Amino acid sequence: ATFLIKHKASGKFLHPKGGSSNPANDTNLVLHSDIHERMYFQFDVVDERWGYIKHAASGKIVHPLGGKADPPNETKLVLHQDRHDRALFAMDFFNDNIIHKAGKYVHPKGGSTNPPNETLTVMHGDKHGAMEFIFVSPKNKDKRVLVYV
Amino acid sequence: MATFLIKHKASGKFLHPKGGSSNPANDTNLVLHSDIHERMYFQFDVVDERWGYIKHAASGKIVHPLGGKADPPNETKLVLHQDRHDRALFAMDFFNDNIIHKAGKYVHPKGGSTNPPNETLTVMHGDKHGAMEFIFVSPKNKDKRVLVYV
Ligand SMILES: CC(=O)N[C@@H]1[C@@H](O)[C@@H](O)[C@@H](CO)O[C@@H]1O
Ligand SMILES: CC(=O)N[C@@H]1[C@@H](O)[C@@H](O)[C@@H](CO)O[C@@H]1O
Ligand SMILES: CC(=O)N[C@@H]1[C@@H](O)[C@@H](O)[C@@H](CO)O[C@@H]1O
Ligand SMILES: CC(=O)N[C@@H]1[C@@H](O)[C@@H](O)[C@@H](CO)O[C@@H]1O
Ligand SMILES: CC(=O)N[C@@H]1[C@@H](O)[C@@H](O)[C@@H](CO)O[C@@H]1O
Ligand SMILES: CC(=O)N[C@@H]1[C@@H](O)[C@@H](O)[C@@H](CO)O[C@@H]1O
C-alpha cells in the first residue's frame, strides 16, 4: 500500500523537508499542506504491528534522530536509509496515532492543532487530538487505506 | 493468508464453533474453549480498510450476529454462517485488543467474566472492559501475536 500520512487536526501531511525524491540521510520530517509523490509513504511490516515507515520515493525510513532506542520527548524525526530495531513503529489506525517501539508518539513540535507548513515532527509521550494521524489514499485524501498490506 | 487463534486475553481461552466441527451448521454458536486444534483456527478477509469477515478456517463460514441485523442489540449471540454481507463486517482492533462490529458493539463472553468456563457463549455488547479483550496469536505459539490483516 502507498498512502499519505495526514495530521488529523490540520489536514497537513508528513513530508521530507524540501520534498526531494532522494532526501539526504537525516533530513527532517515536517508537516506541509502539499500533496505530491515525494510525500507518499509505505509501511514494511517486520513483526506483527511493528515495521518501518518508508518514504516511497527514496526508500529511506523514519528514524528518531540519532537512532536512540528510547528517544526522549522532543527528539526530531528524520529519514535515514539504515534498517534497525530503533526505527520500528506501529501505525495505530484504531486510535489514529503513530507509536514508536519504545512507546512515544509522533507529534508536531509544539502540539498545535494547526501547525504551519514546515513545522518539525518530534517524538512525545503525550496523547491528545493534535497528535492524531490518519492514513489516506494519494487519490482521495479523505479515504482511509489499510497500511498493513 | 494469516491463520490465527482468537484468544480471550483475560482467561486464555479461545474462540471455537460450539462442538468443534470442521463444518459447523449455519447459525452454530461461537463459544470459548481451552483446546487448540485446526477446527478453531480463524482467518480475516479484508473488505474495506479495517472492515472484513472473520472466517472459520476449516469451514469457510464467517462470524455473524445471529439473525444478521445491521444494528444488533446487546446480548445478540455470535454465530457462524456462510453468507457474506455487510452486517457481518468486523474490525480486528489489535491496538486496543478487541473485536468490533460495524455498528460499534464488541465481542464479549456472555456475562463478562474474566475466567469464563469452557462452552461459554459469545455475544455482542457495547461495554468495554478487560473481559472483552482479545488478542490474535499464532497457531504455533499461543503467546505470539500475529498480524491478521495479511
Ligand atoms: C516546489 C516544491 O518542491 N515544494 C516542496 C513542497 O511541496 C513540500 O514538499 C516542502 C516540504 O518541506 O518542500 C518543498 O518546498
Ligand atoms: C551509527 C549509528 O548509530 N547510526 C544511526 C543511524 O542508523 C540512524 O538511526 C540515524 C538516524 O538519525 O542515527 C544514526 O546516525
Ligand atoms: C501543553 C501542550 O500543548 N503540550 C504539548 C505536548 O502535549 C506535545 O504535543 C508537545 C510536542 O512537541 O508540544 C507541547 O508541549
Ligand atoms: C475432540 C474435540 O474436537 N472436541 C471439541 C473441543 O476441542 C472444542 O472444539 C469444543 C467446542 O465446543 O467442541 C468439542 O468438544
Ligand atoms: C434471510 C436473512 O436475514 N438471513 C440472515 C443470514 O444472512 C445471516 O446473517 C444469519 C446469521 O445468523 O441471519 C439470517 O439468517
Ligand atoms: C458484568 C456486567 O456488569 N456486565 C456484563 C457486560 O459488561 C457484558 O460483558 C455482558 C455480556 O453478556 O455481560 C454482563 O452483562
mmCIF file of C-alpha atoms and ligand atoms in Angstrom:
data_model
loop_
_atom_site.group_PDB
_atom_site.id
_atom_site.type_symbol
_atom_site.label_atom_id
_atom_site.label_comp_id
_atom_site.label_asym_id
_atom_site.label_seq_id
_atom_site.Cartn_x
_atom_site.Cartn_y
_atom_site.Cartn_z
ATOM 1 C CA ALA A 1 0.000 0.000 0.000
ATOM 2 C CA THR A 2 1.019 3.624 -0.716
ATOM 3 C CA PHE A 3 -0.535 6.305 1.434
ATOM 4 C CA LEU A 4 -0.396 9.801 2.780
ATOM 5 C CA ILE A 5 0.226 10.431 6.498
ATOM 6 C CA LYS A 6 -2.350 13.086 7.308
ATOM 7 C CA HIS A 7 -2.330 15.152 10.519
ATOM 8 C CA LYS A 8 -5.964 14.885 11.560
ATOM 9 C CA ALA A 9 -6.393 18.245 13.211
ATOM 10 C CA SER A 10 -4.832 20.358 10.395
ATOM 11 C CA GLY A 11 -5.147 18.236 7.280
ATOM 12 C CA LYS A 12 -1.467 18.763 6.554
ATOM 13 C CA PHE A 13 0.760 15.817 5.606
ATOM 14 C CA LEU A 14 4.123 14.360 6.586
ATOM 15 C CA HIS A 15 6.866 15.382 4.119
ATOM 16 C CA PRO A 16 10.651 15.237 3.959
ATOM 17 C CA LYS A 17 11.753 18.825 4.417
ATOM 18 C CA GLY A 18 12.350 20.133 0.863
ATOM 19 C CA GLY A 19 10.215 17.481 -0.806
ATOM 20 C CA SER A 20 13.025 15.598 -2.546
ATOM 21 C CA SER A 21 12.650 12.258 -4.268
ATOM 22 C CA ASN A 22 16.000 11.370 -2.681
ATOM 23 C CA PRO A 23 16.376 13.248 0.646
ATOM 24 C CA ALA A 24 19.790 13.022 2.279
ATOM 25 C CA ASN A 25 20.161 10.948 5.415
ATOM 26 C CA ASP A 26 18.936 12.824 8.484
ATOM 27 C CA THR A 27 16.546 15.024 6.516
ATOM 28 C CA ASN A 28 13.862 16.284 8.907
ATOM 29 C CA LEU A 29 10.226 15.210 8.561
ATOM 30 C CA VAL A 30 7.876 18.145 8.629
ATOM 31 C CA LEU A 31 4.227 18.904 8.132
ATOM 32 C CA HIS A 32 3.179 20.582 4.889
ATOM 33 C CA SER A 33 -0.094 21.118 3.057
ATOM 34 C CA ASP A 34 1.019 19.903 -0.386
ATOM 35 C CA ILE A 35 0.283 16.518 -1.979
ATOM 36 C CA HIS A 36 2.816 15.087 -4.412
ATOM 37 C CA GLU A 37 4.587 11.843 -4.980
ATOM 38 C CA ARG A 38 7.540 12.827 -2.698
ATOM 39 C CA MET A 39 5.283 12.754 0.320
ATOM 40 C CA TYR A 40 3.896 9.261 -0.323
ATOM 41 C CA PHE A 41 4.727 6.589 2.249
ATOM 42 C CA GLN A 42 4.621 2.821 2.542
ATOM 43 C CA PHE A 43 4.856 0.553 5.579
ATOM 44 C CA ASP A 44 7.135 -2.502 5.679
ATOM 45 C CA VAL A 45 5.938 -4.976 8.275
ATOM 46 C CA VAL A 46 8.696 -6.519 10.376
ATOM 47 C CA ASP A 47 6.892 -8.139 13.325
ATOM 48 C CA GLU A 48 3.092 -8.016 13.639
ATOM 49 C CA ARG A 49 2.312 -4.349 14.360
ATOM 50 C CA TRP A 50 5.944 -3.253 14.135
ATOM 51 C CA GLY A 51 7.630 -2.115 10.959
ATOM 52 C CA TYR A 52 9.346 0.584 9.014
ATOM 53 C CA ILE A 53 7.635 3.789 7.808
ATOM 54 C CA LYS A 54 9.105 4.101 4.315
ATOM 55 C CA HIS A 55 9.385 7.238 2.176
ATOM 56 C CA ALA A 56 8.179 5.767 -1.135
ATOM 57 C CA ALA A 57 10.280 7.913 -3.477
ATOM 58 C CA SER A 58 13.651 7.303 -1.801
ATOM 59 C CA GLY A 59 13.126 4.126 0.212
ATOM 60 C CA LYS A 60 14.558 5.785 3.312
ATOM 61 C CA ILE A 61 12.625 5.133 6.542
ATOM 62 C CA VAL A 62 11.564 7.191 9.569
ATOM 63 C CA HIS A 63 14.036 7.301 12.475
ATOM 64 C CA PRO A 64 14.304 9.253 15.694
ATOM 65 C CA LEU A 65 17.337 11.477 15.002
ATOM 66 C CA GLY A 66 20.394 9.649 16.212
ATOM 67 C CA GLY A 67 18.624 6.292 16.276
ATOM 68 C CA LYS A 68 18.221 6.109 20.072
ATOM 69 C CA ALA A 69 16.329 3.154 21.388
ATOM 70 C CA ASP A 70 14.237 5.102 23.897
ATOM 71 C CA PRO A 71 14.144 8.607 22.422
ATOM 72 C CA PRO A 72 13.211 11.438 24.795
ATOM 73 C CA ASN A 73 10.408 13.894 24.268
ATOM 74 C CA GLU A 74 11.207 16.420 21.536
ATOM 75 C CA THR A 75 13.503 14.083 19.605
ATOM 76 C CA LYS A 76 13.254 15.096 15.969
ATOM 77 C CA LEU A 77 12.059 12.636 13.366
ATOM 78 C CA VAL A 78 14.138 12.220 10.210
ATOM 79 C CA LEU A 79 14.587 9.909 7.217
ATOM 80 C CA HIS A 80 17.555 7.563 7.047
ATOM 81 C CA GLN A 81 18.436 4.596 4.833
ATOM 82 C CA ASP A 82 19.517 2.333 7.701
ATOM 83 C CA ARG A 83 17.272 -0.503 8.899
ATOM 84 C CA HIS A 84 17.479 -1.473 12.552
ATOM 85 C CA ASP A 85 15.153 -2.060 15.503
ATOM 86 C CA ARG A 86 15.336 1.507 16.765
ATOM 87 C CA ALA A 87 13.404 2.602 13.652
ATOM 88 C CA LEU A 88 10.384 0.363 14.387
ATOM 89 C CA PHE A 89 6.974 1.993 14.600
ATOM 90 C CA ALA A 90 3.349 0.850 14.516
ATOM 91 C CA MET A 91 0.528 2.541 12.587
ATOM 92 C CA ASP A 92 -2.388 2.619 15.046
ATOM 93 C CA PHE A 93 -5.294 3.118 12.676
ATOM 94 C CA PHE A 94 -7.807 2.473 15.514
ATOM 95 C CA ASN A 95 -6.651 5.175 17.919
ATOM 96 C CA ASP A 96 -5.246 7.252 14.999
ATOM 97 C CA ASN A 97 -1.626 7.662 16.074
ATOM 98 C CA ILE A 98 1.901 6.577 15.150
ATOM 99 C CA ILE A 99 3.750 4.849 18.008
ATOM 100 C CA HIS A 100 7.471 4.120 18.251
ATOM 101 C CA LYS A 101 8.736 0.802 19.636
ATOM 102 C CA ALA A 102 9.607 2.431 22.960
ATOM 103 C CA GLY A 103 6.125 3.872 23.411
ATOM 104 C CA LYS A 104 6.186 7.553 22.460
ATOM 105 C CA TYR A 105 4.160 9.028 19.598
ATOM 106 C CA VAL A 106 4.773 11.194 16.539
ATOM 107 C CA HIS A 107 3.746 14.815 17.209
ATOM 108 C CA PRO A 108 4.008 18.172 15.505
ATOM 109 C CA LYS A 109 6.629 20.025 17.549
ATOM 110 C CA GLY A 110 4.626 22.210 19.925
ATOM 111 C CA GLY A 111 1.469 20.215 19.687
ATOM 112 C CA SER A 112 -0.624 22.717 17.641
ATOM 113 C CA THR A 113 -3.941 21.860 16.161
ATOM 114 C CA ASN A 114 -2.969 23.875 13.070
ATOM 115 C CA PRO A 115 0.795 23.679 12.752
ATOM 116 C CA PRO A 116 2.196 25.915 9.941
ATOM 117 C CA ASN A 117 3.952 24.483 6.943
ATOM 118 C CA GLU A 118 7.472 23.327 7.740
ATOM 119 C CA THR A 119 6.707 22.514 11.380
ATOM 120 C CA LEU A 120 9.074 19.804 12.588
ATOM 121 C CA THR A 121 7.804 16.413 13.815
ATOM 122 C CA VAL A 122 9.112 15.009 17.076
ATOM 123 C CA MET A 123 8.593 12.160 19.477
ATOM 124 C CA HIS A 124 6.445 12.880 22.539
ATOM 125 C CA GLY A 125 4.709 10.698 25.095
ATOM 126 C CA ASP A 126 1.501 12.719 25.332
ATOM 127 C CA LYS A 127 -1.809 11.709 23.732
ATOM 128 C CA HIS A 128 -4.289 14.320 22.540
ATOM 129 C CA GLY A 129 -6.076 15.420 19.417
ATOM 130 C CA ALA A 130 -3.099 17.223 17.911
ATOM 131 C CA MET A 131 -1.002 14.072 17.713
ATOM 132 C CA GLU A 132 -3.601 12.090 15.739
ATOM 133 C CA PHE A 133 -2.848 10.901 12.205
ATOM 134 C CA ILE A 134 -4.837 9.096 9.601
ATOM 135 C CA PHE A 135 -3.534 7.155 6.603
ATOM 136 C CA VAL A 136 -5.224 8.013 3.341
ATOM 137 C CA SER A 137 -5.179 7.317 -0.376
ATOM 138 C CA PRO A 138 -2.970 9.501 -2.561
ATOM 139 C CA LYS A 139 -6.029 9.546 -4.909
ATOM 140 C CA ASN A 140 -8.536 10.779 -2.299
ATOM 141 C CA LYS A 141 -7.151 12.427 0.844
ATOM 142 C CA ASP A 142 -10.317 11.601 2.810
ATOM 143 C CA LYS A 143 -10.250 7.828 2.040
ATOM 144 C CA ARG A 144 -8.533 5.780 4.736
ATOM 145 C CA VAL A 145 -6.456 2.918 3.392
ATOM 146 C CA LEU A 146 -5.045 -0.179 5.080
ATOM 147 C CA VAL A 147 -1.302 0.370 5.549
ATOM 148 C CA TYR A 148 -0.535 -3.185 6.732
ATOM 149 C CA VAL A 149 -0.903 -4.713 3.260
ATOM 150 C CA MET B 1 -3.337 -15.584 4.307
ATOM 151 C CA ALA B 2 -2.696 -15.296 8.090
ATOM 152 C CA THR B 3 -4.209 -18.093 10.198
ATOM 153 C CA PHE B 4 -4.603 -17.308 13.848
ATOM 154 C CA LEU B 5 -6.235 -18.183 17.149
ATOM 155 C CA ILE B 6 -8.687 -15.734 18.711
ATOM 156 C CA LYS B 7 -7.631 -15.671 22.363
ATOM 157 C CA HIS B 8 -9.680 -14.150 25.159
ATOM 158 C CA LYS B 9 -6.988 -12.120 26.807
ATOM 159 C CA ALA B 10 -8.046 -12.418 30.409
ATOM 160 C CA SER B 11 -8.678 -16.164 30.521
ATOM 161 C CA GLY B 12 -6.514 -17.538 27.755
ATOM 162 C CA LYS B 13 -9.478 -19.413 26.301
ATOM 163 C CA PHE B 14 -10.044 -19.394 22.525
ATOM 164 C CA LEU B 15 -12.988 -18.803 20.187
ATOM 165 C CA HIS B 16 -14.413 -22.063 18.872
ATOM 166 C CA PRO B 17 -17.559 -23.185 16.988
ATOM 167 C CA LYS B 18 -19.656 -24.983 19.585
ATOM 168 C CA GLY B 19 -18.908 -28.656 19.056
ATOM 169 C CA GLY B 20 -15.629 -28.075 17.263
ATOM 170 C CA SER B 21 -16.688 -29.291 13.831
ATOM 171 C CA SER B 22 -14.800 -28.826 10.597
ATOM 172 C CA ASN B 23 -18.133 -27.995 9.065
ATOM 173 C CA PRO B 24 -20.436 -26.381 11.660
ATOM 174 C CA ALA B 25 -24.061 -25.882 10.580
ATOM 175 C CA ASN B 26 -25.240 -22.361 9.824
ATOM 176 C CA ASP B 27 -26.089 -20.482 12.992
ATOM 177 C CA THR B 28 -23.724 -22.574 15.185
ATOM 178 C CA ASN B 29 -22.853 -20.580 18.286
ATOM 179 C CA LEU B 30 -19.295 -19.358 18.884
ATOM 180 C CA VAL B 31 -18.063 -20.289 22.365
ATOM 181 C CA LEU B 32 -14.874 -20.013 24.423
ATOM 182 C CA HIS B 33 -12.872 -23.214 24.982
ATOM 183 C CA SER B 34 -9.358 -24.133 26.105
ATOM 184 C CA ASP B 35 -8.421 -26.599 23.402
ATOM 185 C CA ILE B 36 -6.244 -25.808 20.436
ATOM 186 C CA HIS B 37 -6.800 -27.629 17.127
ATOM 187 C CA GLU B 38 -7.338 -26.856 13.445
ATOM 188 C CA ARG B 39 -11.131 -26.542 13.859
ATOM 189 C CA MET B 40 -10.677 -23.386 15.986
ATOM 190 C CA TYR B 41 -8.297 -21.603 13.571
ATOM 191 C CA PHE B 42 -9.594 -18.316 12.084
ATOM 192 C CA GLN B 43 -8.629 -16.090 9.177
ATOM 193 C CA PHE B 44 -9.636 -12.487 8.342
ATOM 194 C CA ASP B 45 -10.744 -11.467 4.853
ATOM 195 C CA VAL B 46 -10.338 -7.728 4.394
ATOM 196 C CA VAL B 47 -13.265 -5.988 2.659
ATOM 197 C CA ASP B 48 -12.740 -2.256 3.268
ATOM 198 C CA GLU B 49 -9.677 -0.986 5.166
ATOM 199 C CA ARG B 50 -10.272 -2.097 8.786
ATOM 200 C CA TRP B 51 -13.528 -3.910 7.980
ATOM 201 C CA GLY B 52 -13.750 -7.519 6.937
ATOM 202 C CA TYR B 53 -15.033 -11.026 7.567
ATOM 203 C CA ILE B 54 -13.849 -13.210 10.453
ATOM 204 C CA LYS B 55 -13.617 -16.632 8.810
ATOM 205 C CA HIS B 56 -13.638 -20.084 10.432
ATOM 206 C CA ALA B 57 -10.726 -21.589 8.523
ATOM 207 C CA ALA B 58 -11.919 -25.184 8.407
ATOM 208 C CA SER B 59 -15.434 -24.469 7.088
ATOM 209 C CA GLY B 60 -15.293 -21.145 5.370
ATOM 210 C CA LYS B 61 -18.279 -19.849 7.357
ATOM 211 C CA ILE B 62 -17.876 -16.394 8.886
ATOM 212 C CA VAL B 63 -18.874 -14.672 12.115
ATOM 213 C CA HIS B 64 -22.332 -13.040 12.201
ATOM 214 C CA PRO B 65 -24.659 -11.565 14.800
ATOM 215 C CA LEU B 66 -27.420 -14.218 14.961
ATOM 216 C CA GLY B 67 -30.194 -13.086 12.655
ATOM 217 C CA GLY B 68 -27.926 -10.779 10.698
ATOM 218 C CA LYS B 69 -29.262 -7.357 11.622
ATOM 219 C CA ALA B 70 -27.319 -4.264 10.904
ATOM 220 C CA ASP B 71 -27.515 -2.815 14.444
ATOM 221 C CA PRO B 72 -27.900 -5.839 16.737
ATOM 222 C CA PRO B 73 -28.822 -5.253 20.404
ATOM 223 C CA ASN B 74 -26.717 -6.163 23.424
ATOM 224 C CA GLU B 75 -26.637 -9.875 24.158
ATOM 225 C CA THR B 76 -27.082 -10.853 20.460
ATOM 226 C CA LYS B 77 -25.402 -14.214 20.103
ATOM 227 C CA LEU B 78 -22.400 -14.637 17.751
ATOM 228 C CA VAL B 79 -22.658 -17.495 15.279
ATOM 229 C CA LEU B 80 -21.091 -18.837 12.124
ATOM 230 C CA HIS B 81 -22.942 -18.513 8.836
ATOM 231 C CA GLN B 82 -21.960 -18.964 5.214
ATOM 232 C CA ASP B 83 -23.422 -15.713 3.943
ATOM 233 C CA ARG B 84 -21.240 -12.729 3.086
ATOM 234 C CA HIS B 85 -22.912 -9.312 3.512
ATOM 235 C CA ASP B 86 -22.397 -6.039 5.176
ATOM 236 C CA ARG B 87 -23.989 -6.946 8.502
ATOM 237 C CA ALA B 88 -21.162 -9.472 9.082
ATOM 238 C CA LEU B 89 -18.368 -6.841 8.971
ATOM 239 C CA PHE B 90 -15.973 -6.576 11.933
ATOM 240 C CA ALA B 91 -12.625 -4.988 12.595
ATOM 241 C CA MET B 92 -9.769 -6.666 14.497
ATOM 242 C CA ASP B 93 -8.517 -3.932 16.825
ATOM 243 C CA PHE B 94 -5.069 -5.250 17.672
ATOM 244 C CA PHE B 95 -4.146 -1.958 19.383
ATOM 245 C CA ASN B 96 -6.990 -1.774 21.906
ATOM 246 C CA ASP B 97 -7.289 -5.604 21.853
ATOM 247 C CA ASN B 98 -10.930 -6.013 20.902
ATOM 248 C CA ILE B 99 -13.221 -7.212 18.068
ATOM 249 C CA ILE B 100 -15.642 -4.525 16.975
ATOM 250 C CA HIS B 101 -18.725 -4.907 14.754
ATOM 251 C CA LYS B 102 -19.583 -2.349 12.090
ATOM 252 C CA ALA B 103 -22.347 -0.870 14.285
ATOM 253 C CA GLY B 104 -19.960 -0.365 17.198
ATOM 254 C CA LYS B 105 -20.560 -3.193 19.686
ATOM 255 C CA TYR B 106 -17.803 -5.636 20.726
ATOM 256 C CA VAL B 107 -17.446 -9.414 21.035
ATOM 257 C CA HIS B 108 -17.891 -10.472 24.700
ATOM 258 C CA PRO B 109 -18.151 -13.670 26.647
ATOM 259 C CA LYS B 110 -21.742 -13.899 27.902
ATOM 260 C CA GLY B 111 -21.778 -12.374 31.369
ATOM 261 C CA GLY B 112 -18.441 -10.640 31.006
ATOM 262 C CA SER B 113 -16.366 -12.996 33.162
ATOM 263 C CA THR B 114 -12.563 -12.739 33.414
ATOM 264 C CA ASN B 115 -12.379 -16.573 33.517
ATOM 265 C CA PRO B 116 -15.348 -17.962 31.534
ATOM 266 C CA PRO B 117 -15.740 -21.711 31.731
ATOM 267 C CA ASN B 118 -15.449 -23.812 28.608
ATOM 268 C CA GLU B 119 -18.559 -23.615 26.381
ATOM 269 C CA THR B 120 -19.390 -20.047 27.443
ATOM 270 C CA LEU B 121 -21.318 -18.375 24.621
ATOM 271 C CA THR B 122 -20.104 -15.196 22.960
ATOM 272 C CA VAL B 123 -22.396 -12.219 22.359
ATOM 273 C CA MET B 124 -22.293 -8.666 21.198
ATOM 274 C CA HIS B 125 -22.221 -5.918 23.828
ATOM 275 C CA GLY B 126 -21.400 -2.291 23.803
ATOM 276 C CA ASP B 127 -19.454 -2.229 27.065
ATOM 277 C CA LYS B 128 -15.663 -2.009 27.164
ATOM 278 C CA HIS B 129 -13.703 -3.653 29.982
ATOM 279 C CA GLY B 130 -10.901 -6.141 30.448
ATOM 280 C CA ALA B 131 -13.077 -9.205 29.973
ATOM 281 C CA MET B 132 -13.957 -8.253 26.382
ATOM 282 C CA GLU B 133 -10.300 -8.021 25.280
ATOM 283 C CA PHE B 134 -8.982 -10.448 22.630
ATOM 284 C CA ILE B 135 -5.567 -10.976 21.081
ATOM 285 C CA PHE B 136 -4.757 -12.748 17.838
ATOM 286 C CA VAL B 137 -1.991 -15.328 18.090
ATOM 287 C CA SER B 138 -0.044 -17.910 16.163
ATOM 288 C CA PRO B 139 -1.347 -21.490 15.983
ATOM 289 C CA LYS B 140 2.288 -22.415 16.664
ATOM 290 C CA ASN B 141 2.731 -20.198 19.716
ATOM 291 C CA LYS B 142 -0.362 -19.009 21.585
ATOM 292 C CA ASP B 143 1.664 -16.163 23.149
ATOM 293 C CA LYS B 144 2.945 -14.749 19.825
ATOM 294 C CA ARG B 145 0.714 -12.083 18.335
ATOM 295 C CA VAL B 146 0.287 -12.282 14.589
ATOM 296 C CA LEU B 147 -0.897 -9.723 12.043
ATOM 297 C CA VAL B 148 -4.384 -10.674 10.938
ATOM 298 C CA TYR B 149 -4.677 -8.083 8.161
ATOM 299 C CA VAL B 150 -2.325 -10.007 5.828
HETATM 300 C C1 LIG C 1 8.058 23.366 -5.103
HETATM 301 C C2 LIG C 1 8.365 22.264 -4.092
HETATM 302 O O1 LIG C 1 9.031 21.322 -4.394
HETATM 303 N N1 LIG C 1 7.804 22.349 -2.900
HETATM 304 C C3 LIG C 1 8.010 21.446 -1.808
HETATM 305 C C4 LIG C 1 6.713 21.277 -1.034
HETATM 306 O O2 LIG C 1 5.705 20.729 -1.885
HETATM 307 C C5 LIG C 1 6.952 20.461 0.221
HETATM 308 O O3 LIG C 1 7.260 19.139 -0.185
HETATM 309 C C6 LIG C 1 8.067 21.060 1.046
HETATM 310 C C7 LIG C 1 8.383 20.272 2.309
HETATM 311 O O4 LIG C 1 9.379 20.840 3.121
HETATM 312 O O5 LIG C 1 9.281 21.124 0.280
HETATM 313 C C8 LIG C 1 9.085 21.903 -0.906
HETATM 314 O O6 LIG C 1 9.004 23.213 -0.567
HETATM 315 C C1 LIG C 2 25.909 4.528 13.661
HETATM 316 C C2 LIG C 2 24.552 4.978 14.065
HETATM 317 O O1 LIG C 2 24.157 4.971 15.230
HETATM 318 N N1 LIG C 2 23.742 5.374 13.066
HETATM 319 C C3 LIG C 2 22.377 5.898 13.251
HETATM 320 C C4 LIG C 2 21.583 5.579 12.022
HETATM 321 O O2 LIG C 2 21.453 4.170 11.940
HETATM 322 C C5 LIG C 2 20.218 6.247 12.099
HETATM 323 O O3 LIG C 2 19.450 5.610 13.142
HETATM 324 C C6 LIG C 2 20.402 7.721 12.334
HETATM 325 C C7 LIG C 2 19.089 8.471 12.443
HETATM 326 O O4 LIG C 2 19.273 9.873 12.641
HETATM 327 O O5 LIG C 2 21.100 7.932 13.538
HETATM 328 C C8 LIG C 2 22.398 7.388 13.450
HETATM 329 O O6 LIG C 2 23.141 8.058 12.573
HETATM 330 C C1 LIG C 3 0.501 21.807 26.689
HETATM 331 C C2 LIG C 3 0.937 21.403 25.318
HETATM 332 O O1 LIG C 3 0.325 21.832 24.318
HETATM 333 N N1 LIG C 3 1.850 20.415 25.256
HETATM 334 C C3 LIG C 3 2.345 19.855 24.033
HETATM 335 C C4 LIG C 3 2.666 18.339 24.204
HETATM 336 O O2 LIG C 3 1.477 17.688 24.572
HETATM 337 C C5 LIG C 3 3.259 17.784 22.939
HETATM 338 O O3 LIG C 3 2.263 17.815 21.924
HETATM 339 C C6 LIG C 3 4.484 18.637 22.547
HETATM 340 C C7 LIG C 3 5.066 18.186 21.224
HETATM 341 O O4 LIG C 3 6.233 18.948 20.864
HETATM 342 O O5 LIG C 3 4.068 20.014 22.343
HETATM 343 C C8 LIG C 3 3.574 20.538 23.536
HETATM 344 O O6 LIG C 3 4.496 20.690 24.505
HETATM 345 C C1 LIG C 4 -12.286 -33.540 20.482
HETATM 346 C C2 LIG C 4 -12.893 -32.225 20.017
HETATM 347 O O1 LIG C 4 -12.830 -31.776 18.865
HETATM 348 N N1 LIG C 4 -13.579 -31.572 20.915
HETATM 349 C C3 LIG C 4 -14.124 -30.241 20.748
HETATM 350 C C4 LIG C 4 -13.367 -29.236 21.605
HETATM 351 O O2 LIG C 4 -11.967 -29.213 21.245
HETATM 352 C C5 LIG C 4 -13.985 -27.879 21.376
HETATM 353 O O3 LIG C 4 -13.746 -27.532 19.998
HETATM 354 C C6 LIG C 4 -15.477 -27.915 21.675
HETATM 355 C C7 LIG C 4 -16.081 -26.599 21.413
HETATM 356 O O4 LIG C 4 -17.486 -26.568 21.800
HETATM 357 O O5 LIG C 4 -16.130 -28.923 20.856
HETATM 358 C C8 LIG C 4 -15.585 -30.181 21.075
HETATM 359 O O6 LIG C 4 -15.869 -30.700 22.314
HETATM 360 C C1 LIG C 5 -32.648 -14.022 5.320
HETATM 361 C C2 LIG C 5 -31.682 -13.469 6.412
HETATM 362 O O1 LIG C 5 -31.664 -12.438 7.176
HETATM 363 N N1 LIG C 5 -30.547 -14.244 6.571
HETATM 364 C C3 LIG C 5 -29.525 -13.932 7.605
HETATM 365 C C4 LIG C 5 -28.202 -14.548 7.185
HETATM 366 O O2 LIG C 5 -27.719 -13.863 6.039
HETATM 367 C C5 LIG C 5 -27.202 -14.470 8.315
HETATM 368 O O3 LIG C 5 -26.820 -13.102 8.539
HETATM 369 C C6 LIG C 5 -27.825 -15.092 9.549
HETATM 370 C C7 LIG C 5 -26.918 -15.033 10.736
HETATM 371 O O4 LIG C 5 -27.490 -15.672 11.882
HETATM 372 O O5 LIG C 5 -29.008 -14.396 9.905
HETATM 373 C C8 LIG C 5 -30.007 -14.558 8.880
HETATM 374 O O6 LIG C 5 -30.434 -15.902 8.788
HETATM 375 C C1 LIG C 6 -20.932 -7.867 34.333
HETATM 376 C C2 LIG C 6 -21.519 -6.809 33.991
HETATM 377 O O1 LIG C 6 -21.774 -5.863 34.956
HETATM 378 N N1 LIG C 6 -21.863 -6.668 32.770
HETATM 379 C C3 LIG C 6 -21.527 -7.541 31.660
HETATM 380 C C4 LIG C 6 -21.373 -6.737 30.388
HETATM 381 O O2 LIG C 6 -20.328 -5.794 30.500
HETATM 382 C C5 LIG C 6 -21.114 -7.676 29.229
HETATM 383 O O3 LIG C 6 -19.807 -8.216 29.380
HETATM 384 C C6 LIG C 6 -22.234 -8.750 29.206
HETATM 385 C C7 LIG C 6 -22.002 -9.753 28.124
HETATM 386 O O4 LIG C 6 -23.009 -10.785 28.142
HETATM 387 O O5 LIG C 6 -22.263 -9.447 30.434
HETATM 388 C C8 LIG C 6 -22.581 -8.626 31.503
HETATM 389 O O6 LIG C 6 -23.859 -8.070 31.460
#
